Ligand binder design. Structure first.
Ligand SMILES: [Cd+2]
Ligand SMILES: [Cd+2]
Ligand SMILES: [Cd+2]
Length: 30
């Protein structure tokens, strides 16, 4: 979980995820 992932993240696919998560943030839709 990066900055905005140490809890709950929406990240639908990448447009909002890959943007704030330059990695497989163990919490987005992965
Ligand atoms: Cd994400
Ligand atoms: Cd993240
Ligand atoms: Cd996440």
């Amino acid at each position: 979980p990066c900055e905005k992932c140490t809890s709950g993240c929406k990240c639908p696919s990448k447009d909002e995820c890959a943007k704030t998560c330059s990695k497989p943030c163990s919490c987005c839709p992965t």
